[PDB]
PDB file of all heavy atoms in Angstrom:
ATOM      1  N   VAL J  20      -9.275 145.350 148.125  1.00 26.07           N
ATOM      2  CA  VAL J  20     -10.666 145.770 147.945  1.00 26.07           C
ATOM      3  C   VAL J  20     -11.218 146.499 149.166  1.00 26.07           C
ATOM      4  O   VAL J  20     -11.424 145.896 150.218  1.00 26.07           O
ATOM      5  CB  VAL J  20     -11.585 144.579 147.634  1.00 26.07           C
ATOM      6  CG1 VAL J  20     -12.900 145.078 147.099  1.00 26.07           C
ATOM      7  CG2 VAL J  20     -10.932 143.652 146.622  1.00 26.07           C
ATOM      8  N   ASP J  21     -11.468 147.796 149.015  1.00 28.51           N
ATOM      9  CA  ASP J  21     -11.997 148.614 150.103  1.00 28.51           C
ATOM     10  C   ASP J  21     -13.400 148.181 150.510  1.00 28.51           C
ATOM     11  O   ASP J  21     -14.198 147.760 149.675  1.00 28.51           O
ATOM     12  CB  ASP J  21     -12.017 150.094 149.704  1.00 28.51           C
ATOM     13  CG  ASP J  21     -10.639 150.622 149.356  1.00 28.51           C
ATOM     14  OD1 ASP J  21      -9.817 149.842 148.831  1.00 28.51           O
ATOM     15  OD2 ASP J  21     -10.380 151.818 149.606  1.00 28.51           O
ATOM     16  N   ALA J  22     -13.699 148.291 151.799  1.00 33.07           N
ATOM     17  CA  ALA J  22     -15.047 148.037 152.285  1.00 33.07           C
ATOM     18  C   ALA J  22     -16.013 149.075 151.717  1.00 33.07           C
ATOM     19  O   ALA J  22     -17.209 148.816 151.585  1.00 33.07           O
ATOM     20  CB  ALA J  22     -15.074 148.061 153.802  1.00 33.07           C
ATOM     21  N   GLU J  23     -15.485 150.246 151.374  1.00 31.30           N
ATOM     22  CA  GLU J  23     -16.304 151.331 150.850  1.00 31.30           C
ATOM     23  C   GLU J  23     -16.986 150.916 149.558  1.00 31.30           C
ATOM     24  O   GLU J  23     -18.123 151.304 149.301  1.00 31.30           O
ATOM     25  CB  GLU J  23     -15.441 152.574 150.603  1.00 31.30           C
ATOM     26  CG  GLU J  23     -16.212 153.827 150.193  1.00 31.30           C
ATOM     27  CD  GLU J  23     -15.306 155.023 149.977  1.00 31.30           C
ATOM     28  OE1 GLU J  23     -14.080 154.885 150.171  1.00 31.30           O
ATOM     29  OE2 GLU J  23     -15.821 156.102 149.614  1.00 31.30           O
ATOM     30  N   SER J  24     -16.300 150.106 148.755  1.00 29.19           N
ATOM     31  CA  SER J  24     -16.871 149.633 147.496  1.00 29.19           C
ATOM     32  C   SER J  24     -17.694 148.364 147.679  1.00 29.19           C
ATOM     33  O   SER J  24     -18.725 148.191 147.033  1.00 29.19           O
ATOM     34  CB  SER J  24     -15.780 149.400 146.456  1.00 29.19           C
ATOM     35  OG  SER J  24     -14.826 148.480 146.941  1.00 29.19           O
ATOM     36  N   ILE J  25     -17.252 147.486 148.573  1.00 29.83           N
ATOM     37  CA  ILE J  25     -17.989 146.257 148.840  1.00 29.83           C
ATOM     38  C   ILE J  25     -19.360 146.613 149.404  1.00 29.83           C
ATOM     39  O   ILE J  25     -20.315 145.858 149.250  1.00 29.83           O
ATOM     40  CB  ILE J  25     -17.229 145.311 149.816  1.00 29.83           C
ATOM     41  CG1 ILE J  25     -17.247 143.871 149.313  1.00 29.83           C
ATOM     42  CG2 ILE J  25     -17.814 145.361 151.217  1.00 29.83           C
ATOM     43  CD1 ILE J  25     -16.171 143.576 148.303  1.00 29.83           C
ATOM     44  N   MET J  26     -19.449 147.770 150.055  1.00 30.64           N
ATOM     45  CA  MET J  26     -20.684 148.198 150.702  1.00 30.64           C
ATOM     46  C   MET J  26     -21.534 149.135 149.850  1.00 30.64           C
ATOM     47  O   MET J  26     -22.737 149.257 150.072  1.00 30.64           O
ATOM     48  CB  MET J  26     -20.367 148.855 152.042  1.00 30.64           C
ATOM     49  CG  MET J  26     -20.337 147.882 153.198  1.00 30.64           C
ATOM     50  SD  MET J  26     -22.011 147.394 153.654  1.00 30.64           S
ATOM     51  CE  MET J  26     -21.694 146.402 155.107  1.00 30.64           C
ATOM     52  N   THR J  27     -20.908 149.798 148.880  1.00 29.31           N
ATOM     53  CA  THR J  27     -21.611 150.751 148.022  1.00 29.31           C
ATOM     54  C   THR J  27     -21.214 150.618 146.551  1.00 29.31           C
ATOM     55  O   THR J  27     -20.515 151.468 146.002  1.00 29.31           O
ATOM     56  CB  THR J  27     -21.397 152.225 148.480  1.00 29.31           C
ATOM     57  OG1 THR J  27     -20.011 152.576 148.392  1.00 29.31           O
ATOM     58  CG2 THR J  27     -21.874 152.437 149.914  1.00 29.31           C
ATOM     59  N   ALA J  28     -21.650 149.532 145.925  1.00 28.58           N
ATOM     60  CA  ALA J  28     -21.445 149.326 144.496  1.00 28.58           C
ATOM     61  C   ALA J  28     -22.739 148.816 143.876  1.00 28.58           C
ATOM     62  O   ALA J  28     -23.563 148.221 144.570  1.00 28.58           O
ATOM     63  CB  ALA J  28     -20.320 148.345 144.253  1.00 28.58           C
ATOM     64  N   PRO J  29     -22.926 149.050 142.570  1.00 31.28           N
ATOM     65  CA  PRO J  29     -24.124 148.542 141.898  1.00 31.28           C
ATOM     66  C   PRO J  29     -24.140 147.024 141.983  1.00 31.28           C
ATOM     67  O   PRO J  29     -23.072 146.418 141.996  1.00 31.28           O
ATOM     68  CB  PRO J  29     -23.940 149.003 140.448  1.00 31.28           C
ATOM     69  CG  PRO J  29     -22.486 149.332 140.319  1.00 31.28           C
ATOM     70  CD  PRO J  29     -22.076 149.834 141.660  1.00 31.28           C
ATOM     71  N   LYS J  30     -25.325 146.427 142.071  1.00 31.16           N
ATOM     72  CA  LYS J  30     -25.445 145.014 142.421  1.00 31.16           C
ATOM     73  C   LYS J  30     -24.759 144.065 141.434  1.00 31.16           C
ATOM     74  O   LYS J  30     -24.414 142.934 141.784  1.00 31.16           O
ATOM     75  CB  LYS J  30     -26.913 144.621 142.607  1.00 31.16           C
ATOM     76  CG  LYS J  30     -27.458 143.670 141.543  1.00 31.16           C
ATOM     77  CD  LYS J  30     -28.810 143.086 141.944  1.00 31.16           C
ATOM     78  CE  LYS J  30     -28.658 141.770 142.700  1.00 31.16           C
ATOM     79  NZ  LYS J  30     -27.895 141.904 143.973  1.00 31.16           N
ATOM     80  N   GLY J  31     -24.565 144.520 140.202  1.00 26.58           N
ATOM     81  CA  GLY J  31     -23.953 143.678 139.192  1.00 26.58           C
ATOM     82  C   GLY J  31     -22.434 143.667 139.101  1.00 26.58           C
ATOM     83  O   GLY J  31     -21.877 142.963 138.260  1.00 26.58           O
ATOM     84  N   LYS J  32     -21.758 144.441 139.943  1.00 28.52           N
ATOM     85  CA  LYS J  32     -20.299 144.522 139.865  1.00 28.52           C
ATOM     86  C   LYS J  32     -19.634 143.200 140.195  1.00 28.52           C
ATOM     87  O   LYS J  32     -20.023 142.513 141.137  1.00 28.52           O
ATOM     88  CB  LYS J  32     -19.749 145.602 140.798  1.00 28.52           C
ATOM     89  CG  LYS J  32     -18.304 145.949 140.511  1.00 28.52           C
ATOM     90  CD  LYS J  32     -17.751 146.939 141.515  1.00 28.52           C
ATOM     91  CE  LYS J  32     -16.365 147.411 141.100  1.00 28.52           C
ATOM     92  NZ  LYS J  32     -15.447 146.269 140.830  1.00 28.52           N
ATOM     93  N   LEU J  33     -18.618 142.857 139.415  1.00 28.22           N
ATOM     94  CA  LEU J  33     -17.815 141.672 139.667  1.00 28.22           C
ATOM     95  C   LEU J  33     -16.559 142.074 140.429  1.00 28.22           C
ATOM     96  O   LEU J  33     -15.655 142.682 139.859  1.00 28.22           O
ATOM     97  CB  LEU J  33     -17.409 141.034 138.345  1.00 28.22           C
ATOM     98  CG  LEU J  33     -17.577 139.529 138.160  1.00 28.22           C
ATOM     99  CD1 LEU J  33     -16.489 139.030 137.220  1.00 28.22           C
ATOM    100  CD2 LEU J  33     -17.555 138.779 139.483  1.00 28.22           C
ATOM    101  N   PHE J  34     -16.513 141.762 141.721  1.00 26.53           N
ATOM    102  CA  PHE J  34     -15.322 142.011 142.528  1.00 26.53           C
ATOM    103  C   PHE J  34     -14.218 140.992 142.291  1.00 26.53           C
ATOM    104  O   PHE J  34     -14.480 139.897 141.809  1.00 26.53           O
ATOM    105  CB  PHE J  34     -15.683 142.096 144.005  1.00 26.53           C
ATOM    106  CG  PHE J  34     -16.360 143.376 144.369  1.00 26.53           C
ATOM    107  CD1 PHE J  34     -17.729 143.499 144.267  1.00 26.53           C
ATOM    108  CD2 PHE J  34     -15.621 144.467 144.776  1.00 26.53           C
ATOM    109  CE1 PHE J  34     -18.351 144.676 144.585  1.00 26.53           C
ATOM    110  CE2 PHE J  34     -16.240 145.651 145.098  1.00 26.53           C
ATOM    111  CZ  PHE J  34     -17.607 145.756 145.004  1.00 26.53           C
ATOM    112  N   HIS J  35     -12.976 141.364 142.587  1.00 25.73           N
ATOM    113  CA  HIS J  35     -11.890 140.389 142.522  1.00 25.73           C
ATOM    114  C   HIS J  35     -11.074 140.334 143.805  1.00 25.73           C
ATOM    115  O   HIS J  35     -10.093 141.058 143.953  1.00 25.73           O
ATOM    116  CB  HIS J  35     -10.973 140.657 141.334  1.00 25.73           C
ATOM    117  CG  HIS J  35      -9.915 139.613 141.153  1.00 25.73           C
ATOM    118  ND1 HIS J  35     -10.178 138.264 141.257  1.00 25.73           N
ATOM    119  CD2 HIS J  35      -8.597 139.718 140.870  1.00 25.73           C
ATOM    120  CE1 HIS J  35      -9.067 137.582 141.043  1.00 25.73           C
ATOM    121  NE2 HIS J  35      -8.092 138.441 140.809  1.00 25.73           N
ATOM    122  N   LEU J  36     -11.500 139.494 144.742  1.00 28.31           N
ATOM    123  CA  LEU J  36     -10.772 139.327 145.994  1.00 28.31           C
ATOM    124  C   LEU J  36      -9.523 138.463 145.816  1.00 28.31           C
ATOM    125  O   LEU J  36      -9.516 137.545 145.007  1.00 28.31           O
ATOM    126  CB  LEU J  36     -11.688 138.733 147.058  1.00 28.31           C
ATOM    127  CG  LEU J  36     -12.993 139.476 147.344  1.00 28.31           C
ATOM    128  CD1 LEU J  36     -13.865 138.667 148.297  1.00 28.31           C
ATOM    129  CD2 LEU J  36     -12.705 140.846 147.920  1.00 28.31           C
ATOM    130  N   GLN J  37      -8.472 138.754 146.578  1.00 29.31           N
ATOM    131  CA  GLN J  37      -7.277 137.914 146.591  1.00 29.31           C
ATOM    132  C   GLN J  37      -7.089 137.297 147.965  1.00 29.31           C
ATOM    133  O   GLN J  37      -7.259 137.976 148.979  1.00 29.31           O
ATOM    134  CB  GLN J  37      -6.035 138.730 146.249  1.00 29.31           C
ATOM    135  CG  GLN J  37      -5.887 139.055 144.776  1.00 29.31           C
ATOM    136  CD  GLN J  37      -4.609 139.818 144.478  1.00 29.31           C
ATOM    137  OE1 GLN J  37      -3.867 140.198 145.388  1.00 29.31           O
ATOM    138  NE2 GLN J  37      -4.347 140.054 143.199  1.00 29.31           N
ATOM    139  N   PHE J  38      -6.713 136.025 148.003  1.00 29.48           N
ATOM    140  CA  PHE J  38      -6.534 135.324 149.271  1.00 29.48           C
ATOM    141  C   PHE J  38      -5.201 134.605 149.292  1.00 29.48           C
ATOM    142  O   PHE J  38      -4.977 133.697 148.503  1.00 29.48           O
ATOM    143  CB  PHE J  38      -7.638 134.296 149.471  1.00 29.48           C
ATOM    144  CG  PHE J  38      -9.019 134.850 149.304  1.00 29.48           C
ATOM    145  CD1 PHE J  38      -9.556 135.051 148.047  1.00 29.48           C
ATOM    146  CD2 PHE J  38      -9.793 135.145 150.408  1.00 29.48           C
ATOM    147  CE1 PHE J  38     -10.836 135.549 147.899  1.00 29.48           C
ATOM    148  CE2 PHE J  38     -11.070 135.642 150.266  1.00 29.48           C
ATOM    149  CZ  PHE J  38     -11.595 135.844 149.014  1.00 29.48           C
ATOM    150  N   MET J  39      -4.311 135.003 150.190  1.00 30.28           N
ATOM    151  CA  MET J  39      -3.040 134.311 150.300  1.00 30.28           C
ATOM    152  C   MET J  39      -3.250 132.902 150.860  1.00 30.28           C
ATOM    153  O   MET J  39      -4.031 132.712 151.792  1.00 30.28           O
ATOM    154  CB  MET J  39      -2.064 135.111 151.177  1.00 30.28           C
ATOM    155  CG  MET J  39      -0.598 134.702 151.030  1.00 30.28           C
ATOM    156  SD  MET J  39       0.544 135.803 151.884  1.00 30.28           S
ATOM    157  CE  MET J  39       0.017 135.594 153.583  1.00 30.28           C
ATOM    158  N   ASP J  40      -2.561 131.922 150.273  1.00 33.02           N
ATOM    159  CA  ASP J  40      -2.405 130.603 150.882  1.00 33.02           C
ATOM    160  C   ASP J  40      -1.055 130.599 151.591  1.00 33.02           C
ATOM    161  O   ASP J  40      -0.004 130.660 150.956  1.00 33.02           O
ATOM    162  CB  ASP J  40      -2.460 129.489 149.835  1.00 33.02           C
ATOM    163  CG  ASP J  40      -2.753 128.131 150.438  1.00 33.02           C
ATOM    164  OD1 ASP J  40      -2.360 127.892 151.601  1.00 33.02           O
ATOM    165  OD2 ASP J  40      -3.380 127.301 149.751  1.00 33.02           O
ATOM    166  N   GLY J  41      -1.094 130.529 152.914  1.00 30.89           N
ATOM    167  CA  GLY J  41       0.084 130.728 153.731  1.00 30.89           C
ATOM    168  C   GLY J  41       0.791 129.456 154.143  1.00 30.89           C
ATOM    169  O   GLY J  41       1.532 129.453 155.128  1.00 30.89           O
ATOM    170  N   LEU J  42       0.557 128.377 153.404  1.00 31.33           N
ATOM    171  CA  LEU J  42       1.140 127.083 153.739  1.00 31.33           C
ATOM    172  C   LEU J  42       2.658 127.161 153.755  1.00 31.33           C
ATOM    173  O   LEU J  42       3.307 126.548 154.600  1.00 31.33           O
ATOM    174  CB  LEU J  42       0.705 126.039 152.708  1.00 31.33           C
ATOM    175  CG  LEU J  42       0.426 124.607 153.173  1.00 31.33           C
ATOM    176  CD1 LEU J  42       1.706 123.883 153.543  1.00 31.33           C
ATOM    177  CD2 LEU J  42      -0.544 124.615 154.344  1.00 31.33           C
ATOM    178  N   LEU J  43       3.219 127.968 152.857  1.00 34.03           N
ATOM    179  CA  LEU J  43       4.665 127.974 152.639  1.00 34.03           C
ATOM    180  C   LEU J  43       5.374 129.225 153.145  1.00 34.03           C
ATOM    181  O   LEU J  43       6.486 129.521 152.715  1.00 34.03           O
ATOM    182  CB  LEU J  43       4.983 127.727 151.161  1.00 34.03           C
ATOM    183  CG  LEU J  43       4.342 126.480 150.536  1.00 34.03           C
ATOM    184  CD1 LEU J  43       4.790 126.293 149.098  1.00 34.03           C
ATOM    185  CD2 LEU J  43       4.651 125.241 151.355  1.00 34.03           C
ATOM    186  N   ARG J  44       4.734 129.968 154.044  1.00 34.14           N
ATOM    187  CA  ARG J  44       5.395 131.106 154.678  1.00 34.14           C
ATOM    188  C   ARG J  44       6.556 130.613 155.529  1.00 34.14           C
ATOM    189  O   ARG J  44       6.390 129.695 156.332  1.00 34.14           O
ATOM    190  CB  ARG J  44       4.422 131.867 155.565  1.00 34.14           C
ATOM    191  CG  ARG J  44       3.330 132.593 154.829  1.00 34.14           C
ATOM    192  CD  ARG J  44       2.339 133.134 155.832  1.00 34.14           C
ATOM    193  NE  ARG J  44       1.871 132.072 156.716  1.00 34.14           N
ATOM    194  CZ  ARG J  44       1.586 132.241 158.001  1.00 34.14           C
ATOM    195  NH1 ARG J  44       1.728 133.438 158.563  1.00 34.14           N
ATOM    196  NH2 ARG J  44       1.161 131.212 158.725  1.00 34.14           N
ATOM    197  N   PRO J  45       7.744 131.208 155.340  1.00 36.88           N
ATOM    198  CA  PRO J  45       8.940 130.834 156.110  1.00 36.88           C
ATOM    199  C   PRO J  45       8.783 131.104 157.610  1.00 36.88           C
ATOM    200  O   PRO J  45       8.195 132.121 157.984  1.00 36.88           O
ATOM    201  CB  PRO J  45      10.019 131.739 155.523  1.00 36.88           C
ATOM    202  CG  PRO J  45       9.263 132.960 155.074  1.00 36.88           C
ATOM    203  CD  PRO J  45       7.942 132.452 154.572  1.00 36.88           C
ATOM    204  N   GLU J  46       9.327 130.229 158.452  1.00 36.61           N
ATOM    205  CA  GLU J  46       9.356 130.481 159.891  1.00 36.61           C
ATOM    206  C   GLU J  46      10.469 131.459 160.243  1.00 36.61           C
ATOM    207  O   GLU J  46      11.548 131.412 159.655  1.00 36.61           O
ATOM    208  CB  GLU J  46       9.509 129.181 160.693  1.00 36.61           C
ATOM    209  CG  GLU J  46       8.188 128.528 161.095  1.00 36.61           C
ATOM    210  CD  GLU J  46       8.343 127.550 162.242  1.00 36.61           C
ATOM    211  OE1 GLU J  46       9.329 127.671 162.999  1.00 36.61           O
ATOM    212  OE2 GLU J  46       7.474 126.665 162.391  1.00 36.61           O
ATOM    213  N   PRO J  47      10.201 132.363 161.194  1.00 36.30           N
ATOM    214  CA  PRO J  47      11.214 133.279 161.722  1.00 36.30           C
ATOM    215  C   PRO J  47      12.299 132.501 162.460  1.00 36.30           C
ATOM    216  O   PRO J  47      12.002 131.446 163.028  1.00 36.30           O
ATOM    217  CB  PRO J  47      10.418 134.129 162.704  1.00 36.30           C
ATOM    218  CG  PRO J  47       9.357 133.199 163.191  1.00 36.30           C
ATOM    219  CD  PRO J  47       8.961 132.406 161.987  1.00 36.30           C
ATOM    220  N   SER J  48      13.533 132.997 162.450  1.00 39.43           N
ATOM    221  CA  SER J  48      14.595 132.372 163.236  1.00 39.43           C
ATOM    222  C   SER J  48      14.245 132.457 164.716  1.00 39.43           C
ATOM    223  O   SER J  48      13.572 133.392 165.147  1.00 39.43           O
ATOM    224  CB  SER J  48      15.948 133.031 162.962  1.00 39.43           C
ATOM    225  OG  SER J  48      15.858 134.441 163.054  1.00 39.43           O
ATOM    226  N   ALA J  49      14.689 131.475 165.489  1.00 39.42           N
ATOM    227  CA  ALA J  49      14.255 131.346 166.874  1.00 39.42           C
ATOM    228  C   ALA J  49      14.666 132.527 167.735  1.00 39.42           C
ATOM    229  O   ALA J  49      14.035 132.811 168.750  1.00 39.42           O
ATOM    230  CB  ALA J  49      14.779 130.046 167.477  1.00 39.42           C
ATOM    231  N   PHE J  50      15.732 133.212 167.338  1.00 42.99           N
ATOM    232  CA  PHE J  50      16.282 134.280 168.160  1.00 42.99           C
ATOM    233  C   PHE J  50      15.922 135.688 167.695  1.00 42.99           C
ATOM    234  O   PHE J  50      16.234 136.659 168.381  1.00 42.99           O
ATOM    235  CB  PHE J  50      17.797 134.133 168.242  1.00 42.99           C
ATOM    236  CG  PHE J  50      18.249 132.766 168.669  1.00 42.99           C
ATOM    237  CD1 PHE J  50      18.912 131.933 167.785  1.00 42.99           C
ATOM    238  CD2 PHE J  50      18.022 132.320 169.960  1.00 42.99           C
ATOM    239  CE1 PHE J  50      19.335 130.676 168.180  1.00 42.99           C
ATOM    240  CE2 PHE J  50      18.443 131.069 170.360  1.00 42.99           C
ATOM    241  CZ  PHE J  50      19.099 130.245 169.469  1.00 42.99           C
ATOM    242  N   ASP J  51      15.272 135.802 166.539  1.00 43.46           N
ATOM    243  CA  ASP J  51      14.894 137.108 165.992  1.00 43.46           C
ATOM    244  C   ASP J  51      13.803 137.718 166.853  1.00 43.46           C
ATOM    245  O   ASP J  51      12.808 137.062 167.150  1.00 43.46           O
ATOM    246  CB  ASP J  51      14.405 136.979 164.542  1.00 43.46           C
ATOM    247  CG  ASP J  51      14.403 138.304 163.803  1.00 43.46           C
ATOM    248  OD1 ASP J  51      13.587 139.184 164.150  1.00 43.46           O
ATOM    249  OD2 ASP J  51      15.209 138.460 162.862  1.00 43.46           O
ATOM    250  N   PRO J  52      14.000 138.978 167.277  1.00 45.24           N
ATOM    251  CA  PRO J  52      13.038 139.724 168.096  1.00 45.24           C
ATOM    252  C   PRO J  52      11.738 139.986 167.338  1.00 45.24           C
ATOM    253  O   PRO J  52      11.757 140.085 166.113  1.00 45.24           O
ATOM    254  CB  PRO J  52      13.778 141.022 168.415  1.00 45.24           C
ATOM    255  CG  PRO J  52      14.747 141.181 167.289  1.00 45.24           C
ATOM    256  CD  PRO J  52      15.168 139.797 166.905  1.00 45.24           C
ATOM    257  N   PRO J  53      10.612 140.068 168.060  1.00 43.76           N
ATOM    258  CA  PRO J  53       9.287 140.291 167.467  1.00 43.76           C
ATOM    259  C   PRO J  53       9.175 141.619 166.713  1.00 43.76           C
ATOM    260  O   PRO J  53       9.782 142.610 167.110  1.00 43.76           O
ATOM    261  CB  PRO J  53       8.371 140.353 168.693  1.00 43.76           C
ATOM    262  CG  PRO J  53       9.126 139.686 169.788  1.00 43.76           C
ATOM    263  CD  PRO J  53      10.557 139.970 169.528  1.00 43.76           C
ATOM    264  N   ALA J  54       8.410 141.624 165.627  1.00 44.77           N
ATOM    265  CA  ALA J  54       7.945 142.858 165.001  1.00 44.77           C
ATOM    266  C   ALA J  54       6.629 143.226 165.686  1.00 44.77           C
ATOM    267  O   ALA J  54       6.136 142.461 166.517  1.00 44.77           O
ATOM    268  CB  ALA J  54       7.743 142.660 163.514  1.00 44.77           C
ATOM    269  N   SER J  55       6.053 144.379 165.360  1.00 44.64           N
ATOM    270  CA  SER J  55       4.970 144.902 166.194  1.00 44.64           C
ATOM    271  C   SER J  55       3.514 144.638 165.768  1.00 44.64           C
ATOM    272  O   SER J  55       2.721 144.148 166.571  1.00 44.64           O
ATOM    273  CB  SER J  55       5.181 146.390 166.473  1.00 44.64           C
ATOM    274  OG  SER J  55       4.707 146.719 167.767  1.00 44.64           O
ATOM    275  N   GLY J  56       3.151 144.964 164.531  1.00 44.11           N
ATOM    276  CA  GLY J  56       1.748 144.923 164.142  1.00 44.11           C
ATOM    277  C   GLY J  56       1.173 143.543 163.868  1.00 44.11           C
ATOM    278  O   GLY J  56       1.903 142.554 163.794  1.00 44.11           O
ATOM    279  N   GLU J  57      -0.152 143.486 163.736  1.00 45.03           N
ATOM    280  CA  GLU J  57      -0.874 142.268 163.368  1.00 45.03           C
ATOM    281  C   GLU J  57      -1.408 142.435 161.960  1.00 45.03           C
ATOM    282  O   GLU J  57      -1.895 143.513 161.614  1.00 45.03           O
ATOM    283  CB  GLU J  57      -2.080 142.040 164.302  1.00 45.03           C
ATOM    284  CG  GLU J  57      -1.776 141.897 165.792  1.00 45.03           C
ATOM    285  CD  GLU J  57      -3.026 141.807 166.643  1.00 45.03           C
ATOM    286  OE1 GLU J  57      -3.671 142.853 166.866  1.00 45.03           O
ATOM    287  OE2 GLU J  57      -3.361 140.692 167.093  1.00 45.03           O
ATOM    288  N   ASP J  58      -1.316 141.384 161.144  1.00 44.73           N
ATOM    289  CA  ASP J  58      -2.062 141.332 159.885  1.00 44.73           C
ATOM    290  C   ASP J  58      -3.550 141.044 160.159  1.00 44.73           C
ATOM    291  O   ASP J  58      -3.880 140.292 161.079  1.00 44.73           O
ATOM    292  CB  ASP J  58      -1.464 140.286 158.949  1.00 44.73           C
ATOM    293  CG  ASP J  58      -0.002 140.545 158.644  1.00 44.73           C
ATOM    294  OD1 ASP J  58       0.407 141.724 158.644  1.00 44.73           O
ATOM    295  OD2 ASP J  58       0.738 139.567 158.407  1.00 44.73           O
ATOM    296  N   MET J  59      -4.439 141.628 159.359  1.00 45.24           N
ATOM    297  CA  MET J  59      -5.884 141.534 159.596  1.00 45.24           C
ATOM    298  C   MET J  59      -6.609 141.266 158.291  1.00 45.24           C
ATOM    299  O   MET J  59      -6.205 141.755 157.244  1.00 45.24           O
ATOM    300  CB  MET J  59      -6.418 142.842 160.177  1.00 45.24           C
ATOM    301  CG  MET J  59      -5.846 143.214 161.531  1.00 45.24           C
ATOM    302  SD  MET J  59      -6.689 142.392 162.890  1.00 45.24           S
ATOM    303  CE  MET J  59      -5.606 142.770 164.261  1.00 45.24           C
ATOM    304  N   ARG J  60      -7.686 140.495 158.354  1.00 47.16           N
ATOM    305  CA  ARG J  60      -8.517 140.257 157.181  1.00 47.16           C
ATOM    306  C   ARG J  60      -9.949 140.615 157.531  1.00 47.16           C
ATOM    307  O   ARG J  60     -10.549 140.006 158.410  1.00 47.16           O
ATOM    308  CB  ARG J  60      -8.418 138.802 156.723  1.00 47.16           C
ATOM    309  CG  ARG J  60      -9.407 138.416 155.636  1.00 47.16           C
ATOM    310  CD  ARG J  60      -8.788 137.573 154.508  1.00 47.16           C
ATOM    311  NE  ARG J  60      -9.277 138.103 153.245  1.00 47.16           N
ATOM    312  CZ  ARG J  60      -8.555 138.196 152.140  1.00 47.16           C
ATOM    313  NH1 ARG J  60      -7.304 137.754 152.130  1.00 47.16           N
ATOM    314  NH2 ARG J  60      -9.093 138.727 151.045  1.00 47.16           N
ATOM    315  N   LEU J  61     -10.481 141.633 156.867  1.00 46.90           N
ATOM    316  CA  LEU J  61     -11.832 142.092 157.148  1.00 46.90           C
ATOM    317  C   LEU J  61     -12.893 141.368 156.312  1.00 46.90           C
ATOM    318  O   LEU J  61     -14.028 141.204 156.748  1.00 46.90           O
ATOM    319  CB  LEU J  61     -11.942 143.607 156.950  1.00 46.90           C
ATOM    320  CG  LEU J  61     -13.209 144.273 157.497  1.00 46.90           C
ATOM    321  CD1 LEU J  61     -13.136 144.390 159.012  1.00 46.90           C
ATOM    322  CD2 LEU J  61     -13.432 145.632 156.864  1.00 46.90           C
ATOM    323  N   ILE J  62     -12.523 140.920 155.118  1.00 43.31           N
ATOM    324  CA  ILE J  62     -13.512 140.390 154.185  1.00 43.31           C
ATOM    325  C   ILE J  62     -13.294 138.910 153.874  1.00 43.31           C
ATOM    326  O   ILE J  62     -12.244 138.527 153.358  1.00 43.31           O
ATOM    327  CB  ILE J  62     -13.518 141.206 152.877  1.00 43.31           C
ATOM    328  CG1 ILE J  62     -13.367 142.696 153.184  1.00 43.31           C
ATOM    329  CG2 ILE J  62     -14.792 140.973 152.102  1.00 43.31           C
ATOM    330  CD1 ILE J  62     -13.421 143.575 151.957  1.00 43.31           C
ATOM    331  N   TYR J  63     -14.302 138.086 154.161  1.00 40.16           N
ATOM    332  CA  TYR J  63     -14.183 136.633 154.014  1.00 40.16           C
ATOM    333  C   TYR J  63     -15.208 136.018 153.077  1.00 40.16           C
ATOM    334  O   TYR J  63     -16.315 136.510 152.947  1.00 40.16           O
ATOM    335  CB  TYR J  63     -14.335 135.964 155.372  1.00 40.16           C
ATOM    336  CG  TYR J  63     -13.201 136.266 156.306  1.00 40.16           C
ATOM    337  CD1 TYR J  63     -13.295 137.289 157.228  1.00 40.16           C
ATOM    338  CD2 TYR J  63     -12.033 135.534 156.253  1.00 40.16           C
ATOM    339  CE1 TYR J  63     -12.259 137.568 158.076  1.00 40.16           C
ATOM    340  CE2 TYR J  63     -10.992 135.807 157.095  1.00 40.16           C
ATOM    341  CZ  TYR J  63     -11.108 136.825 158.004  1.00 40.16           C
ATOM    342  OH  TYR J  63     -10.058 137.096 158.848  1.00 40.16           O
TER     343      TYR J  63
END
């Protein structure tokens, strides 16, 4: 969901946000080198 729509939509629109539950995300192996970027969440 773009911020462009969250900020400029008619007041009656029904948005559908998705939220990951990260309880079961696998751990990286201890020796695997880092990847670069960060995940980000703008809308809460």
Side-chain angles (χ1 to χ4, degrees):
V20 195
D21 301 32
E23 186 179 359
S24 57
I25 226 84
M26 270 285 185
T27 63
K30 112 168 269 61
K32 194 184 188 307
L33 227 211
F34 285 88
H35 185 44
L36 305 173
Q37 284 182 355
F38 308 79
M39 197 172 62
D40 199 329
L42 216 288
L43 307 183
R44 292 172 307 145
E46 269 199 22
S48 49
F50 308 112
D51 197 292
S55 214
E57 301 175 284
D58 302 330
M59 297 277 169
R60 171 136 224 142
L61 193 76
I62 320 182
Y63 293 95

